[PDB]
Write a protein that binds this ligand. Sequence first.
Ligand SMILES: [K+]
Ligand SMILES: [K+]
Ligand SMILES: [K+]
Ligand SMILES: [Mg+2]
Ligand SMILES: [Mg+2]
Ligand SMILES: [Mg+2]
Ligand SMILES: [Mg+2]
Ligand SMILES: [Mg+2]
Ligand SMILES: [Mg+2]
Ligand SMILES: [Mg+2]
Ligand SMILES: [Mg+2]
Ligand SMILES: [Mg+2]
Ligand SMILES: [Mg+2]
Ligand SMILES: [Mg+2]
Ligand SMILES: [Mg+2]
Ligand SMILES: [Mg+2]
Ligand SMILES: [Mg+2]
Ligand SMILES: [Mg+2]
Ligand SMILES: [Mg+2]
Ligand SMILES: [Mg+2]
Ligand SMILES: [Mg+2]
Ligand SMILES: [Mg+2]
Ligand SMILES: [Mg+2]
Ligand SMILES: [Mg+2]
Ligand SMILES: [Mg+2]
Ligand SMILES: [Mg+2]
Ligand SMILES: [Mg+2]
Ligand SMILES: [Mg+2]
Lengths: 150, 237, 138, 208
Amino acid sequence: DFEEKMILIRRTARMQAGGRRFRFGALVVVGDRQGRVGLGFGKAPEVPLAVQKAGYYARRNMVEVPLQNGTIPHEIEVEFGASKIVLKPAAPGTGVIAGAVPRAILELAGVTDILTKELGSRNPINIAYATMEALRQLRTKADVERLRKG
Amino acid sequence: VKELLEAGVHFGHERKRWNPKFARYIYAERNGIHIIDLQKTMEELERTFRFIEDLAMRGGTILFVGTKKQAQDIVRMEAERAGMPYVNQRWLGGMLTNFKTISQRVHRLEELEALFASPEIEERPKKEQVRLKHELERLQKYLSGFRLLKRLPDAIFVVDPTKEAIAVREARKLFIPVIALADTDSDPDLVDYIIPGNDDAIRSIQLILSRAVDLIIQARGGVVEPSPSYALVQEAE
Amino acid sequence: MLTDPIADMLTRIRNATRVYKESTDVPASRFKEEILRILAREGFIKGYERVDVDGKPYLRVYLKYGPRRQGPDPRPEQVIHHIRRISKPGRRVYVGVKEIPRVRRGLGIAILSTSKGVLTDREARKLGVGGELICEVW
Amino acid sequence: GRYIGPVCRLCRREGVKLYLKGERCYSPKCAMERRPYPPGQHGQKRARRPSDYAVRLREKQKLRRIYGISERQFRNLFEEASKKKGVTGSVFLGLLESRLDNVVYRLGFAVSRRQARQLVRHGHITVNGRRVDLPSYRVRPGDEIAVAEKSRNLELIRQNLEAMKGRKVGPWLSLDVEGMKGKFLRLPDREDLALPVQENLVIEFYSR
RNA sequence: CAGCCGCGGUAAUACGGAGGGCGCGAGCGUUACCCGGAUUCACUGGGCGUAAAGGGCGUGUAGGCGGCCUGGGGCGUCCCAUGU
RNA sequence: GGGAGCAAACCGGAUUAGAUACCCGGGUAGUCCACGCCCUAAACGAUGCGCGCUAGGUCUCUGGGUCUCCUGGGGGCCGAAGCU
Ligand SMILES: [K+]
Ligand SMILES: [K+]
Ligand SMILES: [K+]
Ligand SMILES: [Mg+2]
Ligand SMILES: [Mg+2]
Ligand SMILES: [Mg+2]
Ligand SMILES: [Mg+2]
Ligand SMILES: [Mg+2]
Ligand SMILES: [Mg+2]
Ligand SMILES: [Mg+2]
Ligand SMILES: [Mg+2]
Ligand SMILES: [Mg+2]
Ligand SMILES: [Mg+2]
Ligand SMILES: [Mg+2]
Ligand SMILES: [Mg+2]
Ligand SMILES: [Mg+2]
Ligand SMILES: [Mg+2]
Ligand SMILES: [Mg+2]
Ligand SMILES: [Mg+2]
Ligand SMILES: [Mg+2]
Ligand SMILES: [Mg+2]
Ligand SMILES: [Mg+2]
Ligand SMILES: [Mg+2]
Ligand SMILES: [Mg+2]
Ligand SMILES: [Mg+2]
Ligand SMILES: [Mg+2]
Ligand SMILES: [Mg+2]
Ligand SMILES: [Mg+2]
């Protein structure tokens, strides 16, 4: 079935009469590896309990990625916050040339060969979040054809 | 079935507090009030009823919504008339959206309902036997139409899409479609199958809605035997 | 005054679609026509007609969109996802044939004007001539 | 030079069966039998979850450790591969496996990866007639990889060509056993190959 | 000790030692220096309401920039041939 | 030149540990005017000028028309799309 993969996990701190009130957050991808990917952000009192939750949110925000042989139809740039993500598609043997976040989203898309740049805020949450609405955006010689048709 | 020339009940509502998106469904503005072009209404009615029809005979269920006390009862009634949930008092913090749990209400309605009647009714103190009669009493108020609801509903039928829009907003986050009796004061866009004309004014809520029920029952398994709701039109006048 | 008509058309179009108008007047040039024309070929508008809007020539441009949507925000997909002017008054831009770019690793166009006329890239390419890059439309 | 140390202890490092020492890293003794856990004071103890790096790195050190080669030597044939046409990943392996100190381990002659080394080095092998004492020699396709009738008559040769009666040869070789020859037929292929390795991940380590 | 972050006031994985471990290997490490990362000078490719950033306003000179149709010329621009 | 009221500086009076200050009673320059200089600023919308485009609702100033509506010009609130 699915692979769970989890980018980051953090510690957000609250303030209170008498002192700190901690809490946790989790970033999760879920892949099939075949055009289906999931992004989860999972907060709650207990780390585990977080990833857990993340997971679940993951599988509900599903993105259906038109692959095409280890790689993408056509380049995109995408702009979430001032996280900017650059995706450009490559010949097999290329590799998953990204960093950190945007990798294990494509890795888990079942993408195999593609080129990425990040520009702007490095922040993962958004860099992931971008990467998504990046994918969410792609289209196919097919898909396009269909729009313009007369 | 279907009706014609209902200018004598409804035509259009609301002054110049419109929404320009609605714009198209307007005919012209008479004395600052807006006046819907029913003729278009008719086209949609079909396109729409066509949509009820099928989901009716599929087995499937509508959800009716008026928290408007301008039409609070017509709903209860026309929705009792089709074995189809209604919501009436007020819509609720995610009835569909948080359903799982808005449902855990109906659960501890039954639990309380038939824990009256007779058995062991009074094996417990009394500072707490008129407190429970209260928790239940309350569940009774708004959950009453939300009772026959067991899964998510396969439609939503609204009166004021603007007055309940926390209903509409909800539907879609879940992919459920939206029928509504939307008028000028509201956003056409976010309704899937639209009934142009009066958010307001019993006269028309009745006519329209009730017909919708004509249509749910008719095919499914029944016949056309005038509804006991024309009798709460004669109670405004 | 205008500064770039072309710009302005394109924009007027970028602007129109983005809120789902049916059809916008731009005021008319021959050039302007020739461009619109190509959008047709490639299906980016549904077409245009010459009209006279108070006695001064224009070009109603009947834009076109995808199908009503499913879920929150039933707002069509754009057909014209992107339109960007390229040559600009006081920044001109020229490609010769080996240079003509490839739009969305293939999915849209450039419009060039050549000594052989307003073409797409695949148009000018085949035809084997370069020129001024006007814009860039996927 | 090359490594020269506890090998059937890297058998152990990567955590995966590594063939280096022959009969023994074969016959319930290469420890992945007896203690699959990694060498050193912290062996049984649970490890925290490999860093995105670590992996990328291991998988390479694996591939290298495998063929008994130095990273300096290793990379050079990488660089070559990426520069070369067609799926880079493969050709790396392509070329790796085109190594003579391999072409010979492949072709039986000696048990082990390090043996075909010190067997090439000490002279006992030929290619097309000429002798070659260089492990690093890039065997093409056409090459008759031979024993030298000079050492030929040797204990360690007989033994090991005699164990090679009956057994089978990778598609891309013909171990003839009569004249102790052996051909090398066409460049092997990711598919043709054995390897306990994610070549696609080795690439990924050098995109650094 | 220390590249940065920051490590030592008697449980220091960060000081010194030892065992072991990782990387490389006739080398390996420090320094210095150049590109890179750095879309941090942004042509590709950045900004200026509160983060650094609209000139106190205006007039106006150089300069930059220019609405719609036709015609001539071919400086820009484009193509082919060719030399280098 | 002018100098009514104000009021830096300054004289006294309180006040506080001190009070070279907020409080008080006085008081010169200045503040006013002519003519010449100075060119500064939270000179602020802290937002450069222009032209085109892209839902609305409401309140206001001033204009035209077939006048509790329409159309033009300016100040102001909310708010579509969108931006951030
Ligand atoms: K910047
Ligand atoms: K000027
Ligand atoms: K005083
Ligand atoms: Mg930005
Ligand atoms: Mg930054
Ligand atoms: Mg990152
Ligand atoms: Mg290659
Ligand atoms: Mg040290
Ligand atoms: Mg200690
Ligand atoms: Mg310490
Ligand atoms: Mg250290
Ligand atoms: Mg130490
Ligand atoms: Mg740079
Ligand atoms: Mg500032
Ligand atoms: Mg200013
Ligand atoms: Mg300033
Ligand atoms: Mg001038
Ligand atoms: Mg011009
Ligand atoms: Mg001319
Ligand atoms: Mg001419
Ligand atoms: Mg010329
Ligand atoms: Mg004086
Ligand atoms: Mg005084
Ligand atoms: Mg005093
Ligand atoms: Mg008047
Ligand atoms: Mg105004
Ligand atoms: Mg206004
Ligand atoms: Mg908004």
